[PDB]
């Protein structure tokens, strides 16, 4: 029946204080989070400037959790990308943002497509993008609006830029349109 073309939601995954090295006492600082958030904020402003849907996702762990302690300031969304009234915030406890959360029900109450930003590239961004595309959403990922960190495995240390590049490459075309905040803004 009568439809809008405005079925793309901006989905911000866990831009939470513990991820920012500029946040005093951050328990899980990532590489380049501030810059990533700067780009996410750019996108945030564009969506609100249009009629478009904006959905936030936030993670909490137990009080002896390593980071994102439940109820802590460290688990609060960073002010550079803070939520506004009307914009749903989904609280999650698993890596995948659809798992045991209301995310689907939420999207299904507004959404056809997603623009994905947030953290961490190799963990929660990978998970939500692949889960979403498999569920049927057309996904894009603003690559300069996500963040990760340096990884090590069995003696090999992969710097964050390379972690990010591998995951973004993996997601590009197979699962999502991977493009700049500015490129996505331009359209």
DSSP per-residue letters across 75-95: GSBPGGG---TTS-EEEESSS
Experimental structure resolution, Å: 1.8
What do you get for the CA distance between the two ends of the chain, in Å? 26
In angstroms, the Cα distances linking 69 to 18, 32, 72, 82, 141 are 9, 22, 5, 18, 27
DSSP codes of every residue in 125-142 = IHHHHHHHHHHT-EEEEE
Q: How far apart are CA 59 and CA 17, in angstroms?
A: 11
Superfamily of the domain at 1-187: Isochorismatase-like (3.40.50.850)
Domain ranges of the chain: 1-187
Q: How far apart are CA 11 and CA 117, in angstroms?
A: 6
Q: How far apart are CA 179 and CA 128, in angstroms?
A: 17
The neighbour count for residue 79, using CB atoms within 10 Å, is 10
Solved using: X-ray
Contacts of 50 (CB under 8 A, 6+ apart): 6
Strand 138-147 and strand 176-179: pairing? parallel
């Amino acid at each position: 029946g009568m439809t809008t073309e405005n079925t793309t939601a901006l989905l911000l995954i866990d831009f939470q204080n513990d991820y920012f090295s500029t946040y005093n006492g951050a328990k899980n600082p990532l590489v380049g989070t501030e810059a990533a958030a700067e780009q996410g904020a750019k996108l945030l402003a564009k969506f609100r400037q249009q009629g478009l849907p904006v959905v936030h996702v936030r993670h909490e762990f137990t009080d002896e959790a390593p980071f994102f302690l439940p109820g802590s300031d460290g688990a609060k969304i960073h002010p550079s990308v803070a939520a506004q009234e009307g914009e749903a915030v989904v609280l999650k406890h698993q890596i995948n943002s659809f798992r045991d959360t209301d995310l689907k029900k939420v999207l299904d109450d507004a959404i056809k497509k997603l623009v994905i930003v947030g953290a961490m590239t190799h963990m929660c961004i990978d998970a939500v993008t692949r889960a979403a595309e498999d569920l049927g959403y057309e996904c894009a990922v603003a690559h300069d609006a996500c963040a990760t960190l340096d990884l090590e495995f069995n003696g090999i240390t992969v710097p964050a830029a390379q972690v990010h590049a591998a995951f973004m490459s993996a997601l590009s075309f197979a699962y999502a349109n991977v493009a700049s905040a500015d490129e996505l803004i331009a359209g």
